[PDB]
Ligand binder design. Structure first.
Ligand SMILES: O=c1ccn([C@@H]2O[C@H](COP(=O)(O)OP(=O)(O)O)[C@@H](O)[C@H]2O)c(=O)[nH]1
Ligand SMILES: CC(=O)N[C@@H]1[C@@H](O)[C@H](O)[C@@H](CO)O[C@H]1O
Ligand SMILES: [Mg+2]
Ligand SMILES: [Mg+2]
Lengths: 503, 445, 503, 446
C-alpha cells in the first residue's frame, strides 16, 4: 500500500502548489506513510534531481514519468568532463570557457563539442552538444549514466528538434519518441506503440499496479485529469484544491461557474472519493454551494498548507507601536494603499515603524511614492531576510490582500503572537481573524474605492494601540495558532488516511 | 391576422415589438426551428413536441450529457468536448445575457469531420438531433418528443417533412410550405391580413393561397444593392396575389429600392421605421464606457490625452491583460476586472458615452444596449457589428480624426446641442413614433 | 453462470458452421446449463427470428447484437397488413401485388407504400417502404411493432442509405447509426458515441457483465476477433475450429501457413483458456503441429459438432438404388463431378436416382448441365429442405468434397445407415468410413484432371448395387453411429465445462 | 583485392559467381543495409551489430511483435496489423522467393501517414529503426546492438554518422564514403585492386583512394540510352584515377558504349559475360509451362489446338478465374493451383518449355528461374520482365500470328535442335565459358 501524488512540473523558481505539496511529503514521512510524487512535464534544461533536492524531495519518493521505464534510478549528476572525454575519440585543441558553456574544438575534423556545466566552478556536466560542420546533430543528458538524448536537424538553417531517446543503465534503448511542431507525436517501446501522450499516462498507471490499498492525489488536472480518473477507480482518488475554485462576480443563484483548473473534477466529483481545501471556510462555502446547484454530496476534508513546530515565544523587547508585513510588493497586493495607512495614522499615533520584507517588480512604484509623501523616513524599505524569527519584535501584521485562499505569512504571524488586520475575504484572511477577537475585518464595497478604507484602515489601528487590548487579543492569537500546530496537522492527515481506507 | 416570419432576428424582434404599440395584437408563428423564442411565439417545429411553455432552465455548459469521464472544456465564446484531449464535440453557445448556455452541441469523428448536431431549447430538451453526410453537407432533421418519440422528419434533400404525431395517422408533406399551410388550419387562425419578413418560404405560402380572401403585407429588413430579387419583380406586376403591398423601413434602403421601379411601380410601398423605447433620457454626462474581451484599443491612449475631463470606463469578464492595467496610471482610466452583472447596469447608468473601438467582437450586444439607453453610439471603422445603429456624421477611421472625434462631442455643450447630434442617430436607426404606424395602416386594417 | 456463443450472421440457407450451434443448442437445453447465441451481422432482408427458429433455436436463447440494446426482444412478426395502412392519412383505391410484395397508392400527392410480406398467402408485413414524388424517404421493419427504421435520399439518381435507427416498444429513440457507402460509421446513444463497429461490440460485451465462471465461445473471428479477446479475459474463453486448420501445401517443416479464419487465435492462443475440435485425429495433428512450431500447449478437447438423438430406421419400403447429396453447394464441394459419375451409371444401372439438396454457388451451372446431359428426369435439384427422415429414404450417399473437418451431412447419413462413397482424406472422411465395412474411400492424385477421378468413382458404385453389400453395411454404419450419440455427446461436454471452472 | 558492391540484387550475384568460378574469392563488401546477405559477403552496417553467421531463420509474418491482442493480417503479397480493425502497421515481405518472410515493417500514425520503419534481417529480429519527418521525408536510421545498445546512428539530412561501438570511444564521421574507408581500414583488407558495379558511392571510394597503390575495375551493368553519365566520361578524360578500365558484360550495352564518345575510349571498354550455374539439362520432353498472376494469357486459345502433341501446365497459387477453367475441356491441359513453395518447382522439374505470353506481373521472378533451369523461353512482344534472357529469334508478335512460334519450336524434336536453339538464348544474356574470364581478367593481379 502506498500514496501517489501527481503534478505537472517543477523548477528552481516554484509556486505555492509545489511547496504545499513538498511540505505534504514531510508530514507523510512521519506518518510512516510511503509516498511517491509523480511529475509529468518534460524536464531537461536542469536535471530532474537537482530540482527535487532544492524543494527538499527525497529521491526515492520521486517517480518521474519519463524515467519510470528506464531501470536507471533518479540520481544527481556525478558525470565529469573527464568521464565525457573518455567516450570521445581524438584529442582537443581549443578549450573555451564562457561560463557554464564550455566549448572544446577539434578543427582537425569539422566536429566540436559545446558542453554545459551545472555550476561554472564545478566539474559537473548535465548535457552535451555534439556538432559537425556547425550543424547540431546529437544532444545528450546525464544523471549517473546517459539517460536521455535528442536528435536534431537543420530546417531553414535553424536547428530543429526531431526525435528523443531514453536509455538504460547498460546503454540499451528503453524507448524513443517523435517530435513534430514541438509536440510529442509517437512513443515506441519494444513492446508498445503510442499515438497520444494523453494515452501514455494510462500505460504508466497500469504499470504501477494500483491495488485498492493505495491512494491517489491530483493537484493540476491540466494535461491528465481525464485519464487519471478513468484509471484510478480501482484505488482511492482525491483532488486537492488550491487558491479559488470559482468567480462569484460571474455567477448567480441559478448557475455556478468553477475555475478552469477545477471545473472537470467538480462536475464529475461523484467518481472522486474526497476533496481537500485549504481552509475550513472554503470547506463550508463550497459544501454549501455543491448540494444546491447540482444534488451530489462528496465528502470534504480540511487541511492546511504549512504548519508550526512551536508557538514562537519572545523574551526579546516587544516593541510597542509598530507594524510589520511580508509580501512581494506586487500590484495584486494593493499595498500602494497601505502607505496612507501609515502617513494618515501618524498624526494621532506617534512613533510607529512598519517593516517591508519583500521583493518584486513594479516595486519602484513603492519606493517612489513613500518619499514624496509627508513622512518618508517613517517606514523602512527592505527586500528580504529570514522571517521566521523577527515577528515577535513588532506589534501588528498588516494585510492588503484582495483574496488569498490560504497563507502562511499569517500562519507564522500567529506563531509569534502578533495581532493581524485584513479584509473580510476568502479565505485565510477570514479564518485567522474574528472581528471581535485578535483583529479587525474590513468588508469592501464591490469596487476599489480608494479613500473609502484609506481612513478605515487607520481607524482600527488606533483601537489596538489606544488601548488595553494591545496584548489581550494577542495572547488569544496563540489559542488560534494552537489548532494549526504541526502536531494536529499530523493527526488529521493520518485520521484522513483511515477516513478513506476504512469503508 | 397572424405574424409569419422565417427567422427570429434582432430585426424581427423589434418589429413584433413595435406592432404591439399600435394595438395590433396578432399571434406569431416562426418558420425557423429555434427553441429560445420568448413566451409570445411558437413554431410549427416546436409546438407539438410538448416542451413545457414558459419554463427557463437552459443547460449549463458542463451538464451536456457526455460519455463517462469525457472532459468538458472552458468557456469564453465556445465550449468543446474531448476524449483524451482529442477533439470530439463543440458546444456552441446561446445568445443571451448570462453566457455559456447551450444552443447547439456538435459532435465529430477522429478526423474532425462534422456529422451530428443536437439542438436545445430554452428548456434544454435534446429535442433535435441533426445528421450530416460525406461532404459535410446536410441530411435530415428529427424533431423529438420530450419522451423520445418521433414527430417531424425534414429530409433536407427532397424537402419531404414526415409528421407522425401522437395517436394520429402518418402524413407526408411535399415541401416545407405545405407543412406551414397544414399547421395553420388545425390551429384555426384567421388569415384576412398577413405579415411576413422574408422573400423566402414566408412568401411562398401566399402564392399557394391566392384564392382565399383578403390582402397581405411583405416587410423588407434585408439590404439591396443593384437589382431586385427575382421574386420582387413578381410582386410588382401581379395583382390577384394576396400580397399587394411591400414595406421598407430604412431612410436609405427605401429610395434606393424605388429607384429601380417605373412610374407605375412605386405606389405599392409605404416607408416607416420602428419604435425603440429607451429606459431613460440622455442627460449629457461626461463619462464614457468600453467593453472588451482582451487588449487592446486602437488609439486608446491618444484619446486619454485628448480629453482630461471625463472618465473612461473599460471592463472585462476575463482577468485583464497588463496592457490594460498600464493605462490605469492616469486618472480618467478606470478598469473593471472580472466585472459582475451587478456592476454592469451600474456602469451603463453612470455613463452617457459609449465608444466602440474595442478590438475583437461584440459583448452580449453591448452596441444595442448603448443605443437603448440613449448614449452617444460612435466609433471608427473596424468596428463591432451591429452597425445597425450608428450614423455617418458620428463615424471615423483608424484613429486619424481622433482629435475631431473629441470636438464633435465637445461641440455638444448647449443642452439641446447634444440633442441635435442625438436625433441624427435617432433617425439613422429609423426611430419613429407609433403615431406613424397608425396613420399608415388605418387604411390597411 | 451462462454460456455465450459468438457468431457473425445467419440466413435461411446458412452454412454448417451455423447448424453446429443449432445442434449445440438443443444439447445444452438438456444439460440444465443456460446459454445464449450472439449474432453481430446486419440482418434485414428478412426478420432475424424466422431464421433463428428455422434452424432449431429457441427465441429466448438468441441475443441479437442490434436487438439486445432495446426492450423489444426477439419474436416472429405479428403485424397485419391492415395495421400499417391504418397508420397513414387518406385511403387508397388502386392496389398492386406480386410475389411477397404489396403496393398501395394514394396518388393525389404522389406517394405510395411498397410492403414486404413474410410469405405470399399471409398478410404479415416484414418491410414497409415509403416513396414520395418518386424518391424513397423511409423504410420501416417490423416484428410485433416498429423495431427499426431506415432513411434514404437520392445520389446520382440512386436510392442511397444515409442514416438508420432503432426503436423501443414505446417508440423511443435508443440509437441511430450513420451510413457512408455500405459501412456503418457512428452510433448516437444518449450517453455514448462510437466511430467503429469493433468498439461497439466492446460496449456490448462490457455491458453483459461477465462473471468469473462465464464462458465465451468464438466461432467466427472475422472483424470482431480482437474485440472478443480483450474484453473476455475476465471470464473463461474458448475457440472451436470448424474447418481444416492449416495449409500443408505451403508449409515447410520450418514454417506453417495457417488458415486466416483461425490465425489470430493460434498466434495469441495463450490468452484463450481452451480449444475445441471434433475428430481427435485433428487434435493430435494440430496439438503436435502446435508445439513443434510455436511451442504452445493449450488445453484442447474433442467434441462432435452434431449428434444423434437416436439412429433412424426408415420403416417404409427401402427405396431402390437411390443417391443423395447435400452441402453449401459451392466450388469447394466439387458437386460437378458427381453429376459426371451418374449419367454413365445411368447406363449399366438405369432408373437409379440422385438427389441434390442445397442452396449456393453455381447451382445454376449444375442445372445448365443436366438439361443437355443424359439425365432428363434422373436428378432432383430441390434446394435446401428439412432432411430429418429424408436421408433414410435413399440407398447411398455421395460426397466429392476434398476436405471436411467433420462433414455432418454424412453424420446424419450414418444415422440412416446409408453406405458412403468419397475420397480418403482428413478428417470426417477418415473418421466415418473404414473401407472394410460401410463405405469406400478413394486415394487421389493431387491434381484435378477429369478423366482420372470420375471413372474410378463408379468402380465401387456398381459392386454395391450389384450386389450383396448394400444390406449389411447399412448396419455397420449404424454400429459406428453408436460412437457419436447424444448420450456420449452430452457426456464430453458436461465435464469439460467445470474442467475449466476448476481454477 | 576486394569486391565492392553498392546494392544487392540478382544482377550483382551473377558477378560474385562468375568471378568465383574464374577463381577470384577476394573479400566482398556491400554498401547497402541488407540483412539477408548470403554470408559470403558483409556490409559496414551489419558487421558491428553482433548477430551470428550461418543462421537463416527469418520471422513469419504472424510473429512480428505487436501490442496485446492486436490483430495481424497477411495476404501473401503484404501483411498488416490493425488495432480495432484500423490499419496501424504495414509489413513487407522479403525479396526472397519464400512467401511471408519479413524484411521491413512500417508503422503508420493515427492519420495513416508513415512514421517509423523497423527493418528485419535474415536472423529474425529487428536490427534497425528508421524515422520520418512530416511529409514522409527520410530523417534518420538508428542501428542497434543485439542487446539494443546504440551502435550506428546516421542522419540522412546532413550525411553525418555517429559510431558508438561497445566500450569504445565515439567517432563522428561526415560522409557515407568516409565511413566506408574506415571499414576497409578496420578489417585491413588487401586493397590491391577493387571491383564495383555502379557509379554510386562504391565508385566514389575509388575516387577517394585515387593516390593509393593499385588499379581498379568497374563492371558496368545498368542500361544506357542516349548519353554516357558525367561520372563515367570522368574516367575517359582522366588518367590517374584508380579505376582504369570499364567492363560491360551485356553486349547490347558494349556496342552502344563505343558508339558515343570517339577516339581512345574503346581501349578501356572491354567485353565479358556471366558464366552461370545451370541447374539441369533440357531432356526434350513434350511438357511445357506458363506462370500467371493474371488470367488471361494472350494467344493461348490458338496454340492449344495447334499442337495437340503437347501439354500446357499453367498455374497460379492464386484462385483461378472461371474463364480459364473453360479451357480445361481441351484435354491436353492440366491446371495446378495453390502450390507449395517446393511444389511450384514441381513444374520447373517436369517442364522443359516456358512461354511468356502472360499479361501480368512476373511471379517469383518466373523468367529467371526458367533460365537457370534451361527451360526454353519463347514468347511475344507481350513478354514479361526480365526480357534480358530471351533471344530475339524466339520473340514474336503481340497477339499477332502465333504459329511461327509453333513450327519453330516444333523444330526442336531432336537433341541437336534444342542444343543449337538454347545457345542463342544462352548468349542473349552473354553466358561465357569460365575460360574467357581467365583471359580477360588475367591482365590484372591474379
Ligand atoms: O438440405 C439440407 C442440407 C443441409 N442441412 C444441414 O446443413 C449441414 C451441412 O453441414 P456440412 O458440414 O455437411 O456443410 P458445411 O459445414 O461444410 O457447410 C448439415 O449438418 C445439415 O444438418 C440441412 O438441414 N438440410
Ligand atoms: C469444408 C469443411 O471443413 N466443412 C466443415 C464441416 O465439415 C464441419 O462439420 C463444420 C462444423 O464444424 O464446419 C465446416 O467448416
Ligand atoms: Mg475512452
Ligand atoms: Mg487497445
Amino acid at each position: 500500500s502506498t500514496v501517489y501524488n501527481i503534478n505537472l512540473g517543477i523548477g528552481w523558481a516554484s509556486s505555492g502548489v509545489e511547496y504545499a505539496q513538498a511540505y505534504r511529503a514531510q508530514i507523510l514521512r512521519r506518518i510512516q506513510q510511503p509516498a511517491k510524487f509523480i511529475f509529468m512535464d518534460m524536464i531537461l534544461a536542469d536535471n530532474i534531481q537537482h530540482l527535487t533536492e532544492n524543494i527538499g524531495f527525497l529521491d526515492e519518493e520521486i517517480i518521474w514519468l519519463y524515467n519510470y521505464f528506464t531501470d536507471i534510478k533518479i540520481a544527481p549528476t556525478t558525470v565529469t568532463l573527464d568521464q565525457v572525454l573518455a567516450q570521445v575519440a581524438g584529442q582537443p585543441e581549443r578549450s573555451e570557457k564562457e561560463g557554464k558553456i564550455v566549448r572544446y574544438f577539434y578543427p582537425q575534423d569539422d566536429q566540436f563539442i559545446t558542453c554545459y556545466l551545472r555550476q561554472e566552478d564545478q566539474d559537473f556536466v548535465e548535457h552535451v552538444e555534439y556538432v559537425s560542420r556547425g550543424r547540431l546533430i546529437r544532444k545528450d543528458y546525464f544523471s549517473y549514466v546517459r539517460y536521455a538524448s535528442e536528435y536534431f536537424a537543420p530546417h531553414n538553417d535553424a536547428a530543429t528538434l526531431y526525435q528523443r531517446r531514453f536509455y538504460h543503465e547498460d546503454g540499451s534503448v528503453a524507448y524513443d519518441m517523435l517530435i513534430e511542431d514541438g509536440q510529442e507525436k509517437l512513443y515506441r517501446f519494444p513492446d508498445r506503440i503510442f499515438y497520444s501522450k494523453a494515452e501514455l499516462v494510462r500505460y504508466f498507471l497500469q504499470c504501477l499496479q494500483l491495488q485498492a490499498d493505495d491512494v491517489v492525489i491530483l493537484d493540476r488536472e491540466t494535461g491528465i485529469g481525464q485519464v487519471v480518473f478513468e484509471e484510478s477507480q480501482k484505488a482511492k482518488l482525491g483532488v486537492v484544491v488550491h487558491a479559488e475554485h470559482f468567480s462569484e462576480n460571474a455567477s448567480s443563484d441559478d448557475y455556478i461557474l468553477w475555475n478552469n483548473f477545477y471545473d472537470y473534477q467538480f462536475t464529475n466529483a461523484d467518481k472522486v472519493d474526497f476533496f481537500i481545501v485549504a481552509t475550513e471556510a472554503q470547506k463550508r462555502i463550497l459544501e454549501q454551494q455543491f448540494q444546491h446547484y447540482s444534488d451530489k454530496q462528496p465528502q470534504i476534508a480540511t487541511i492546511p498548507v504549512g504548519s508550526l513546530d512551536q508557538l514562537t515565544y519572545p523574551k526579546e523587547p516587544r516593541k510597542p507601536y509598530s507594524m510589520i508585513t511580508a509580501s512581494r510588493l506586487a500590484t495584486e497586493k494593493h499595498i500602494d494603499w497601505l502607505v496612507a495607512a501609515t502617513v494618515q495614522a501618524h498624526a494621532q499615533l506617534p512613533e510607529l515603524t512598519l517593516d517591508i520584507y519583500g521583493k518584486g517588480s513594479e516595486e519602484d512604484k513603492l519606493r517612489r511614492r513613500i518619499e514624496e509623501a509627508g513622512a518618508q523616513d517613517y517606514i523602512r524599505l527592505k527586500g528580504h531576510a529570514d522571517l521566521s524569527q523577527i515577528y515577535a519584535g513588532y506589534e501588528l501584521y498588516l494585510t492588503a490582500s484582495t483574496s488569498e485562499g490560504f497563507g502562511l505569512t499569517l500562519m507564522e504571524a500567529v506563531g509569534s503572537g502578533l495581532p493581524l488586520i485584513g479584509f473580510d475575504v476568502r479565505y485565510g484572511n477570514q479564518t485567522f481573524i474574528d472581528d471581535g477577537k485578535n483583529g479587525y475585518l474590513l468588508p469592501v464595497s464591490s469596487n476599489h474605492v480608494e479613500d473609502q478604507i484609506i481612513a478605515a484602515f487607520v481607524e482600527k489601528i488606533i483601537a489596538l494601540f489606544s488601548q488595553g487590548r494591545q496584548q489581550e487579543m494577542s495572547q488569544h492569537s496563540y489559542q488560534v495558532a494552537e489548532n494549526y500546530l504541526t502536531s494536529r496537522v499530523e493527526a488529521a492527515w493520518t485520521q484522513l488516511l483511515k477516513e478513506v481506507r476504512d469503508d | 391576422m397572424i405574424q409569419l416570419f422565417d427567422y427570429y432576428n434582432q430585426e424581427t424582434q423589434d418589429l413584433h415589438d413595435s406592432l404591439l404599440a399600435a394595438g395590433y395584437a396578432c399571434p406569431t408563428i416562426v418558420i425557423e426551428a429555434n427553441g429560445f423564442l420568448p413566451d409570445d411565439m411558437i413554431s410549427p417545429y416546436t409546438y407539438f413536441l410538448g416542451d413545457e411553455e414558459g419554463v427557463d432552465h437552459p443547460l449549463f455548459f458542463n451538464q451536456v450529457p457526455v460519455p463517462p469521464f469525457w472532459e468538458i472544456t472552458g468557456d469564453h465564446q465556445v465550449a468543446r468536448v474531448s476524449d483524451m484531449g482529442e477533439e470530439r464535440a463543440r458546444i456552441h453557445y446561446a445568445s443571451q445575457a448570462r453566457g455559456r448556455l447551450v444552443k447547439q452541441v456538435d459532435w465529430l469523428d477522429k478526423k474532425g469531420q462534422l456529422r451530428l448536431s443536437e439542438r436545445y431549447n430554452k428548456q434544454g430538451r435534446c429535442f433535435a438531433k441533426t445528421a450530416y453526410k460525406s461532404g459535410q453537407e446536410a441530411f435530415n432533421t428529427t424533431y423529438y418528443s420530450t419522451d423520445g418519440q418521433e414527430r417531424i422528419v425534414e429530409n433536407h434533400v427532397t424537402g419531404d417533412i414526415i409528421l407522425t404525431l401522437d395517436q394520429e395517422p402518418l402524413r407526408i408533406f411535399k415541401s416545407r410550405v405545405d407543412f406551414i399551410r397544414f399547421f395553420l388550419e388545425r390551429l384555426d387562425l384567421d388569415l384576412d391580413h398577413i405579415l411576413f419578413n422574408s422573400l423566402a418560404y414566408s412568401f411562398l405560402v401566399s402564392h399557394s393561397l391566392t384564392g382565399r380572401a383578403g390582402q397581405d403585407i411583405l416587410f423588407w429588413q434585408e439590404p439591396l444593392y443593384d437589382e431586385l430579387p427575382g421574386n420582387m419583380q413578381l410582386i410588382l406586376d401581379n395583382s390577384q396575389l394576396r400580397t399587394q403591398t411591400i414595406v421598407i423601413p430604412d431612410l436609405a434602403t427605401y429610395e434606393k429600392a424605388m429607384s429601380l421601379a417605373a412610374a407605375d411601380q412605386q405606389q405599392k410601398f409605404l416607408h416607416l421605421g420602428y419604435h425603440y423605447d429607451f429606459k431613460r433620457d440622455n442627460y449629457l454626462r461626461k463619462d464614457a464606457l468600453i467593453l472588451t474581451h482582451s487588449d487592446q484599443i486602437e488609439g486608446l491612449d491618444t484619446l486619454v490625452q485628448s480629453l482630461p475631463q471625463l472618465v473612461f470606463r473599460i471592463a472585462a469578464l476575463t482577468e485583464m491583460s497588463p496592457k490594460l492595467l498600464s493605462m490605469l496610471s492616469y486618472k480618467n482610466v478606470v478598469l473593471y476586472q472580472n466585472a459582475s452583472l451587478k456592476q454592469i447596469e451600474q456602469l451603463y447608468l453612470e455613463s452617457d458615452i459609449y465608444l466602440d473601438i474595442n478590438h475583437g467582437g461584440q459583448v452580449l450586444q453591448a452596441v444595442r444596449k448603448a443605443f437603448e439607453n440613449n448614449l452617444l453610439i460612435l466609433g471608427f471603422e473596424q468596428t463591432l457589428h451591429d452597425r445597425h445603429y450608428i450614423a455617418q456624421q458620428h463615424i471615423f477611421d483608424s484613429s486619424q480624426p481622433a482629435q475631431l472625434a473629441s470636438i464633435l462631442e465637445e461641440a455638444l455643450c448647449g443642452v439641446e446641442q447634444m440633442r441635435s447630434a442625438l436625433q441624427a442617430q435617432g433617425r439613422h436607426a429609423n426611430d419613429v413614433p407609433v403615431s406613424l404606424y397608425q396613420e399608415t395602416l388605418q387604411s390597411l386594417l
